[PDB]
C-alpha cells in the first residue's frame with residue numbers, strides 16, 4: 003500500500019482546496035481522481051476556434067470571497083460579464099428590453115403579485131438557518147410541499163407564476179414539482195437572497211476567470227505534483243483496522259489516517275464500505291439526485307446584438323424555447339463573439355435525442371426571433387456539454403432535495419463517519435452548489451481533520467473570510483414601496499374591509 | 503477469467519428465478535451475490551425460540567401465480583394467515599372490532615368520503631396501463647403531484663385523510679409527500695386494485711410459506727451448487743470487447759455472452775460501467791430510492807387475542823403509535839404464538855435510535871392497549887430487522903418514485919444496455935414490489951436473452967401463468983351503493 007496522512011477522494015475544486023490546505027499545513031496528502039483530468043464540474047475546453055471556453059462552472063461574483071482569494075493566490079484574474087446594454091424578457095412570443103436585475107411589469111395587480119413573490123421568498127428565507135435548515139420553525143410544513151405547490155399558493159397571477167417557474171428551473175436545473183420548498187428557500191437564502199442570486203452586476207453572474215475556471219484545479223495539481231493520481235476511481239473504503247484502506251478500480255491500495263470524501267453525495271454509492279455506512283447515510287445517498295442541464299455556446303463573427311443596444315442577456319419564457327437563459331460569452335478583448343445558453347431540466351432530457359447540428363439550428367432560430375436579428379442564423383462555431391451523461395458527476399449544477407428529504411436526512415450530510423470527513427459544495431453553508439461553496443467545504447473538512455489530530459483548536463474549524471478588495475459587494479437594499487405594498491390577497495382584504 | 507454463457511448479478515428471488523430458467527434451458531450460468539447468503543429482501547432466521555421467522559418478505563396470495571408455481575416446484579407448501587376472528591381499528595385511543603377488509607364508519611358524511619376515496623383510487627387506476635404508466639392520459643398531471651396533494655383534494659374529512667395516509671405508508675413504506683400520485687396509483691392498480699392489495703382473505707396477505715420464504719432462494723442455490731458465488735459484490739462491468747467482463751470486489755473476473763442485473767435499480771450505482779451508461783439510465787439510478795421499515799415480531803406463550811374473538815390484525819391510527827399495522831404470526835399448529843408489526847416510513851427513522859429492548863417495551867404497551875390485555879406485557883421472545891441499514895438492499899419493501907420521475911425516466915427501467923438485461927421486482931408489470939414480481943421479471947429477463955440467442959421467438963418473451971389450483975382467486979365485487987353513492991362535494995352540488 004501507498005501510505006499518507008490523508009486520502010482525498012475527488013479532484014474537483016473542493017478536494018483540491020482541501021488537499022492544498024493540508025499540504026500547506028505540512029501533511030502528506032494524496033488525491034484520488036476518477037477522470038483523466040482534475041476540475042470535476044468545472045471544465046475549460048481549449049482549441050483554436052474558441053481559444054478557451056468554460057463548459058461547466060464559470061461565473062463568480064461579490065460575496066464569493068473564498069473562491070476569489072484562492073484564485074488570486076494561484077495568479078488568476080477576473081473580468082466582468084457584458085451588462086452594458088439592455089437585457090431582454092421574451093414572453094408570449096415578443097421581446098421586452100429592460101434595465102435592472104428584475105424584468106419589470108406595468109399592470110398594477112401584476113406589479114403587486116411580482117413584488118410580493120420576491121419579497122416572500124426572502125421573508126421565508128430569513129426563518130431558515132444557513133447551517134441547519136431543518137431547524138426552521140415550519141421546516142416540516144415547508145419540506146412536505148414542492149415548489150410547484152408553494153407557487154400555486156403564492157402567485158395570484160399567471161405572469162408571476164411563469165417567471166417564478168423559470169427562476170426555479172434556472173437556479174437549480176430542476177422542475178418546480180421535483181424539489182422541496184424548504185430546500186429551495188434554503189438554497190436561495192444561503193446565496194444572500196433573490197437579488198444576489200439573480201443578478202449579473204452586483205450578483206452571482208458578475209464575472210468570469212481570464213483563461214477559464216479549470217485553471218483553479220489545474221494550478222493546485224501543479225503545486226501538489228505527483229500527489230494527484232488521475233484515472234483512480236475509488237471502489238472500496240475499509241475502516242476496520244488501525245489505518246483506513248482506500249482501494250481504486252485499477253487495483254491500487256492507499257493507507258491513511260483519515261479520508262475526505264469530496265464527491266457529490268449520491269456518488270458515494272459507487273464506493274463499497276466496510277463496515278457498512280450507518281443507516282441514515284446509507285439511505286440519504288439514494289435520495290439526493292443532481293439536476294439536468296446542457297450548456298451551449300454559439301459563436302458569431304461579431305457581437306452584433308450590442309449594435310441593437312442588447313447586452314446579450316435573454317430571459318425566455320415558453321415550452322417551445324429550448325433555452326430559457328443566455329449571457330454574452332464574448333472574450334474581454336471583444337473577439338470570439340459568443341452567446342452562452344442553458345437548456346434546463348426536462349428540456350435537457352427532451353432535446354438530448356437531437357444531433358449537435360439539430361440543437362445548433364434550434365438555438366440560432368430562437369436567438370434570431372428574440373434579438374429580431376437575421377445575423378443570429380449565421381454562426382461560425384458551436385460547443386456544448388450535456389452534464390446528464392457524466393458517470394462521475396451525475397448532473398449539474400448541483401444536488402437537489404425532493405420533498406421530505408432535507409428534514410429527515412439533512413443532519414447527516416456533513417456528519418463524519420469514523421475517520422471519513424465530507425467536503426464538496428453540497429456540504430457548504432454559503433453558496434452551496436457553486437465553486438465558492440466547494441472551497442468553503444474543502445477547507446472546513448481539512449480543518450476538521452487538523453482538529454482531530456490536535457493541530458488546531460475547535461473554534462478554528464469554521465473560519466470567516468475577509469472581503470475581496472477586487473470585487474466589493476454592494477449591499478442588497480429595498481424601497482419603502484417594495485417593503486410595504488400589499489399582496490393581491492392583502493389588497494382584497496383591504497377592499498372587503500372598506501366596503502363594510 | 504471464469505467463462506460462462508450468462509452472469510446474473512444478485513441472488514435474490516429475481517436473480518435465482520432467471521438463473522434457474524437459463525440453467526434448465528442448458529446454458530452455463532453464474533450467480534454473483536454480494537452477501538454471505540442468498541434471498542436478498544427475503545431472510546428467514548431459524549433458532550429454537552421461533553423455529554423459523556420471516557424478517558423480510560413473507561406473504562403470498564391469490565393472483566400471485568408465478569411465486570406459487572416456483573415454490574411448489576421446489577417442494578414448498580403454504581398455510582393461511584389467521585383471519586378467523588375480528589380485526590381491530592384503533593381510533594382516538596379506542597378499539598373498534600370489525601369484519602371484512604375495509605374498516606367501517608358510522609357518520610354518514612364520513613361514510614360518503616371514505617367510500618369515494620377507495621372508489622376514486624380504482625377509477626384512476628383503470629386509466630393507467632400496467633406495462634406503461636407514463637402512457638396514462640393524465641400521466642404528467644398525476645406524476646407532478648404527490649399523494650399528499652391528491653389526498654388534500656379528494657378527502658373532505660380528516661377521518662378519510664388519516665386512513666388514506668396509513669394506506670400509503672403501509673403499501674409503500676413512504677410518506678404521502680415523498681411519492682408521485684401517478685406512481686402510487688399505478689402500484690395499486692398493478693396488484694389488482696384496492697381490495698386485492700389490502701385484503702388478507704382473498705388478497706396479498708392470505709398465506710405464508712411453511713418453513714419461511716427464504717427457502718425459495720436457498721433451494722434454487724441447492725440446485726445450482728457452486729454456480730452461486732457468495733461474497734462476490736460486483737464493482738465493474740466492461741462491454742467494450744467480444745465478451746462481457748464482470749469484476750468482483752474480491753478480485754475475480756467473469757466472462758459471459760450476456761448479463762442479467764437482478765438488483766434494485768439504485769444499487770446499479772455501486773457498479774462502475776465501461777463504456778458509461780446512456781444519459782437517461784445514468785440519471786435514473788440516482789432518482790429511485792427504497793422505502794423505510796422495521797419488521798418486528800413479539801412472541802407470547804399463547805395466541806391470547808383469539809380468546810377475545812380478535813384475529814391479531816390491528817390497524818392503528820395516529821402519530822404516537824410506533825406500529826400502524828399488525829398480523830397474527832402464530833405457526834399453523836397454534837404454537838410459537840406471535841404478533842408481527844411494521845414500524846413504517848418516518849417512524850422507522852425516528853425509532854431506530856432506541857435499543858432493541860426499548861422498542862420491545864413500546865410495542866408491548868401499544869398491543870396491551872389495543873388488544874385490551876395485560877398478557878401483551880409478558881413477551882417470551884423478540885426478533886426485529888431494520889431494512890434501512892442494508893448496504894445491498896437500500897431499504898424495503900421496494901423502490902418508490904418521487905414526483906416527476908416516472909414520466910421522465912420510467913421507460914428506461916427495463917430497457918437493455920447492449921448485452922445487460924434488467925430483472926428485479928421493480929421491472930415487473932404485476933405485483934411489482936413483491937416476490938411475485940421478482941419471479942415475473944427474472945423469467946422475462948432470462949427469455950429476452952434466449953430470444954437474443956435465437957432460441958425462442960419474440961412472442962415467448964412475455965408468458966402468461968396458469969391459475970394456482972391450491973390458491974384460487976375469488977372475484978373482487980362491489981355493491982350498487984358503493985358504485986353510486988355521491989362524494990361529499992357530489993352531495994353538496996345536489997344542494
Ligand SMILES: *Cc1cc2c(cc1C)nc1c(=O)[nH]c(=O)nc-1n2C[C@H](O)[C@H](O)[C@H](O)COP(=O)(O)OP(=O)(O)OC[C@H]1O[C@@H](n2cnc3c(N)ncnc32)[C@H](O)[C@@H]1O
Nearest residue numbers: 012014016036042043059060061236398426427435436437
Ligand atoms: C456543470 C455546471 C456546473 C456549474 C455551472 C454550470 C454547469 C453546466 N455554473 C456555475 C457557475 O457559473 N458558477 C459556479 O460557481 N458554479 C457553477 N456550477 C457548479 C460548480 O461547477 C460546482 O459547484 C463545483 O465545481 C463543485 O465542486 P466539487 O469539488 O464540490 O465537486 P466536483 O466538481 O463534482 O468534483 C468531484 C470530483 O470527484 C471525482 N469523483 C467522483 N467519483 C469518484 C470516485 N469514486 N473516485 C474518485 N473520484 C471521484 C469527479 O471525477 C470530480 O473530479
Ligand SMILES: *Cc1cc2c(cc1C)nc1c(=O)[nH]c(=O)nc-1n2C[C@H](O)[C@H](O)[C@H](O)COP(=O)(O)OP(=O)(O)OC[C@H]1O[C@@H](n2cnc3c(N)ncnc32)[C@H](O)[C@@H]1O
Nearest residue numbers: 512514515516536542543559560561736898927935936937
Ligand atoms: C424487506 C421487506 C420486503 C418485503 C416485505 C417486508 C419487508 C420488511 N413484505 C413482503 C411480503 O410480505 N410479500 C412479498 O411478496 N414481498 C414483500 N417484500 C418485498 C420482497 O421481499 C421483494 O419484492 C423481493 O424479495 C425482491 O426480490 P429481488 O430479487 O427483486 O431483489 P432482492 O431481494 O433485493 O435481491 C437482490 C440481490 O442482489 C444482491 N446485490 C446487490 N448489489 C449487488 C452487487 N453489487 N453485486 C452482487 N450482488 C448484489 C443483494 O445482496 C440481493 O441478494
Ligand SMILES: O=C(/C=C/c1ccc([N+](=O)[O-])cc1)c1cccc(C(F)(F)F)c1
Nearest residue numbers: 061104105165169172173199200317399
Ligand atoms: O435566477 C436567475 C439566474 C440564476 C442563475 C443561477 C446560477 C447560474 N449558474 O450557476 O451559472 C446562472 C444563473 C435569474 C436571472 C435573471 C432573471 C431572473 C428572473 F427574475 F426570474 F427573471 C432570474
Ligand SMILES: O=C(/C=C/c1ccc([N+](=O)[O-])cc1)c1cccc(C(F)(F)F)c1
Nearest residue numbers: 561604605665669672673699700817899
Ligand atoms: O394497505 C393495507 C395493507 C397493505 C400491505 C401491503 C404489503 C404488505 N407486505 O408487503 O407485507 C403488507 C400489507 C391495508 C390493510 C388493511 C387495512 C387498510 C386500511 F384500510 F387502510 F386501513 C390497509
